[PDB]
Structures are given as C-alpha cells and as structure tokens.
Design a protein around this ligand. Sequence first.
Ligand SMILES: CCCCCCCCCCCCCCCCCC(=O)OC[C@H](COP(=O)(O)OCCN)OC(=O)CCCCCCCCCCCCCCCCC
Lengths: 55, 486, 90, 64
Amino acid sequence: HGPELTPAVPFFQPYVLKWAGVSLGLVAFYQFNSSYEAKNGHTWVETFFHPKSRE
Amino acid sequence: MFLTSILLSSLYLFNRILAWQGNVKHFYLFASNLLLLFIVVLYINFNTFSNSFQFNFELFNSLNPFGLSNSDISNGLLFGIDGLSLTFILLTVLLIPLTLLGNWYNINFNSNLYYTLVLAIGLVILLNFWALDYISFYILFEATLPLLFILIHIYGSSDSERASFYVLMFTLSGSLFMLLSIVVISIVLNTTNFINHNLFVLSLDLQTIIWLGLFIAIMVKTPLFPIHVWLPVVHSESPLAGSMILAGLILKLALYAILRLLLPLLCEAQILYTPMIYIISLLTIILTSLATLRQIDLKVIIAYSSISHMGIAILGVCSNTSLGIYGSIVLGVAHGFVSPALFLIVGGILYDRYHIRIVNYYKGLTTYMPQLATYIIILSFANIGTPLTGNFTGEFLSLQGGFIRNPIIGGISCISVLLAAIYQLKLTNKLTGGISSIYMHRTNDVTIREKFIMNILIISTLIIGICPQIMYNLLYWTVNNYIYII
Amino acid sequence: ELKPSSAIQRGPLNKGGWDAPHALHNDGAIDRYAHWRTFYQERFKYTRATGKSTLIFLVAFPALIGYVAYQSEGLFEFAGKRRGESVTTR
Amino acid sequence: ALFTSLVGASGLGFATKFLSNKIRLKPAGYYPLGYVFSGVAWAGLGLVLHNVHQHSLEVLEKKK
Ligand SMILES: CCCCCCCCCCCCCCCCCC(=O)OC[C@H](COP(=O)(O)OCCN)OC(=O)CCCCCCCCCCCCCCCCC
C-alpha cells in the first residue's frame, strides 16, 4: 500500500528560476510601458528610438 | 586617427590574448557577440518609415582608397540596408556565435585555424547582405568558397575530399554564368547599383537573355531539381559549423539574391517565365522529398529536407503577390532557425558520441536519453509545417501566393505538407522508439551547451510562430516593392 | 649524393587528445551495406528499368507539368465571384 | 585623404614583413625594426601613386 518514494528533489530547479524570471520580467516590463504610455503619451523605449528624419 | 587607434589597440589586444591563451575561441565569441550588440543598436536607429537605404558607406573609392569617401564622383563599392536586407542580417548575426559555440570541444588538433575559418565565413556572409553594387554583391558572394573548400577538406568525415570538391565545383560553375549575366548588365547600363536599377528598362529580347544567367545560378544555389546534387554530400561529409552556416545562411542568401537582383529589372521577362519556375519548383518539391524515403544515412535526410523547403520558398518569391513575398521571407528566416538545430541533432549530439551516421544503428534513444528524444520530436514537428512555429507561416503564405499566380500548380504544390511529414516522422519514430539498440552503448545526456543552442533555436521559431508580425515592421516596404501588377 | 639536409630532425605527427573508448560495435554487414549504398553511382549502369525511370521522371513528368503550367497562366481568377459569372478568362 | 593612404600602405608593408617573417618559421616580432623599414617603403609607394593620381585629376580638370 506504500507509495515507495524516490529521493527528495527541490522545487526551484535552476531552469524553473531562469525561465520564470525572464518571462515574468518581460511581462512586467510590458505592463510598465502600457502604464507609462498613459502618463506621457509615448512608451518608455520609444525615447531610445532615434532614427534620422526621412528628409 | 581615432578609428586607426582603435584598430591598433584591438590588434594589439588580440596578439596579447594569443601570447597568453593558446586558443582564440573566447575572443572570437566575444567579437561575434559584440557584432550582435552593434547590429541591434543599428536596428534601434533604423528608420522603418523610409523606403531608403539608411546606413550607407563607400569602400575603395578613387579619392580615398583606404576608408570612407565623401566625393561627388563614386566608383568604389557601395554598402547599405533596407528592411529586406536587415532581416537576414539579424538571422545572420545570432547564428554566428552559435556555430562558434557549436564546436567548442569537438575540434582538438588545430583549434585556431578552424575557428578563424568559421568566423571568416560568417563575416563574409554578413557583408553579403550589406552590398549595393552588382559587382560588390558578387565579390563577397564568392569570397566564401576558398574558405569553404579549406574547411570541408581539412575537417570532415572520411570523404572530406569529394565534398570539398563539389562545394567548389557546382557552386563555382553556376556562379560563372551569373557573372556572364552581371557583365552583360554592366556594359549596357554602365552602372552596377542596387538603387537605380528599377528605373532602367531593357528590351524584352535583351531581358530574355540576361535572366537565364542569373536564374541558373539561383538554381544551383537554392538547389532546384536539375542541379540539387552537391547539397546532400556537402552536408553529409561536412564538419558541424560548415554544415550549419551552409544550410542556415547560404541557401537563404540565394533566396535573397532572387529578390534583390532579378525582380527589379527583369519584370517584363519574369512574367513570361513564371511557369518555368513553377515547373522546376513543383518538380523539386515532389521529387526530392520522395527521394528522402530511401536513405541509409542520417545527415543526408536533413539535407534533402532543406532542398524541399527551399523549393517551397521560391514559389512564393515568383508569385507576384504580397503574400508570397512575405511568406518566402518568413520561411527563409524560420528555416534558418529550425534547420541548424537539426544538423546539431544529427551532427553534434549524435556524431560526437558514436562517430557513425548510418541510420540502422540507432534505435530506442528515449530510454537512455529522454530529453534528447524530447528535442528530436519537437524539432521534427517544427520542420513539417505543424503550426505556431514560423515554418508553417512560411509554408502557408508561400503556398497561398503560389495558388494566386496559378491555381493548378498550387493544387499539387499543396501536397508538400504530406510529403514533408512522411520522411521526417519516419525518421523520428525510428530514432525515438524501440528497445535500445544493441550496437549503441549508453553515453552521456545532452550537455548544457547543446541544450543552450537548442533552447535558443526553438524559442526563436516559436516567437515567429505565435506572432509573425514582430518583423513586419521591416518588410512592409519590401513586400510592396517587387510586385508588378501594372 | 642528394639527400635532404641533416638539420631537419623531423618527428612523428599525432592528432592529440583523449582516447575515447568505443561506444559502438560496428557491424561488417551494415558498414558494407552503407558503403555500397553511398557509392552506388560508380557502379550504376543503364538498363531497361533505368531507361523507364529516366524517361518518366526526367522527360515525361517535366513535359506534362510543363503543358499544364503554360496552359493555365491567366485562366483563373476566383477573387470576387458570383453566381452566373464565369471564372475562366477564356 | 592623403593620411589614410599613408597609414594603409604602411599597413600593407606591415603585412609583407609579417608574412615574410612567418614563411621563415620565425616568430612574428622577430626583427622589429624591419616593420618600420618595410612600412616606410610601401608607404613611399603610396606617396608616389597618390601624387600621380592627383596630377591625373588635375589634367582632367584642365580640359574644360
Ligand atoms: C575578402 C573578401 C573581399 C573583401 C571586400 C570587402 C572588404 C570589406 C572589408 C571590411 C571593412 C568593411 C566594414 C567597415 C567599413 C564600415 C565602417 C564604417 O565606419 O561605416 C560607416 C557607416 C557610416 O559612417 P559615416 O558616414 O562616416 O557617418 C557616421 C555618423 N555616425 O557606418 C555604418 O553605417 C555602420 C556600418 C556597419 C558595417 C557592418 C559590417 C559587418 C561586418 C563587419 C566586419 C567586416 C570584416 C569582414 C572581414 C572578412 C572580409 C570579407
């Protein structure tokens, strides 16, 4: 009737930490731009977009 | 003085890293990773709202042979980008460290040679997409081949010699008639240029002749059915980085050259000849994907797979449609992602361990390598045209554009979705399932570097698969540019 | 009387590194089979079966798909269609 | 520019001295003064070719 367990492993493996951290960071940054656009009329990274004028 | 002092500093730092570290491969990775940083900072300053060529520079002008030139008279070699160039440059530059990564422990004997040749090939195919003359496109179009000959000959399988010969021979022999056609353009117009050349009109009897010389070279390099002949052996007897840079970048370079060189000034020719291209395109989709079924070797299958996908790709280019052009670009970029991962799976994880590429030895790879078998299946299904991967977006918009221009050619062109699945899943279930093979003794699981390469080359398919709009900001000019619907 | 010089001291060439132990028992039958399959073209000869396949896949099939492709250039639009409207131009 | 032609022709001279050291199975910096010697010689060929091209352009300007 026993489950006959294998040895214990930790939850937060390095891959879970890396992939969750990068994905949650990208989603949080996207929400930060959607909130920053309502305050100022443009996204935050658009301030870094400096192309030459077409003329 | 400033830009010369930078070079005198960096060559000195190079010499010192040589004197203290025997390899260079750290400095080569560092340089190619810096090239990434530089090209994405060029992407930030890129204006998408202009059809123009934004970042222009002349080399080898009369008044300044060594360096930049600001003169009222220009005869050197021009360079610059639009959106259409820049997409491939992105697909180029993120591939370049990975092949420099891809042989980090395989090559033991002569390290610095091999990594120098691999980085030099990658830099030449960087500058292929910057070029703006017909001659400056062509000088670097063929700068690759000595480096490829020396790379395939010195390192490879037991049959390095014949494969290095064929990559010189067929590629050269098509490129010579390409040069014939370039000469005939350069003596009529007296100007090789990627800027003005849609303005000039040639006679229909004169476009009729010029276009054959460029098109048979593109038949050689995107291997269409009459000469699709070097492609399996130059893969199957290559080393790893040569095969990756070949099938990820050289075939897409000729897919780029059919856009950049032919569709602007051969338009009135090009309409008269789209049925010949559709003959050869359908006949290289059907008959190469059918020859995949009878194969004993394992890298050769992924080679003929690349032939079948480029055969799908070029009938979106010659489709005279917005859909077909955009689908050919997204197929070219997504195949450049998914295909070097497959050449890693046959060449890196599976030839470094057992050193024999015959299919008959390999059975039941799941029970000793579960996460490799996981890769083999999700890279299998990404190759076929199973969606949310970017390969299906290319295949779908290419088949749709090919259905516009001629519906009956699209009807038999559409069965490629079946024919591309047959051999790929026939390989995948033989590798994935069964009792583990009595020939193969058990070896190591897939290492961290190989899983790193794989994770990048699979995320970069999935992002284009979930949203192909992420790179429409570059192409929406160049999708409208090449269309001739009067 | 002409021998290459005494100040050479040439030595053997290794390929260097670690003797990786054999992870594979090669089969003589499978290796002979695959070496026969990859180098098939140096023993290929024309027979009636070769002539049949070379006729049908290199000559007959391109001519058939050619005729079908050149007849059907500007026949079909289906772009915006109605009942009672012909879709062939001709 | 006159200066970039000098620096690059001296770079060609550094390349000839490097490759000539390294056919000899010498190290790179075997005889360091010969870099200066060959660089000034190939730079002088750059001087000559640049001045000839100056004069040829000035002849083409006088035909108007
Ligand atoms: C052997 C084959 C035959 C070789 C024939 C071709 C020889 C190529 C030799 C390599 C040198 C070319 C690369 C360096 C030239 C460009 C440097 C440069 O300064 O670009 C100038 C350009 C605009 O600059 P400017 O107009 O002065 O205004 C600046 C305002 N901020 O600024 C820009 O727009 C940015 C330019 C980016 C260039 C990216 C090129 C990617 C590849 C770089 C490495 C190339 C080395 C390849 C070596 C292998 C040889 C092919």
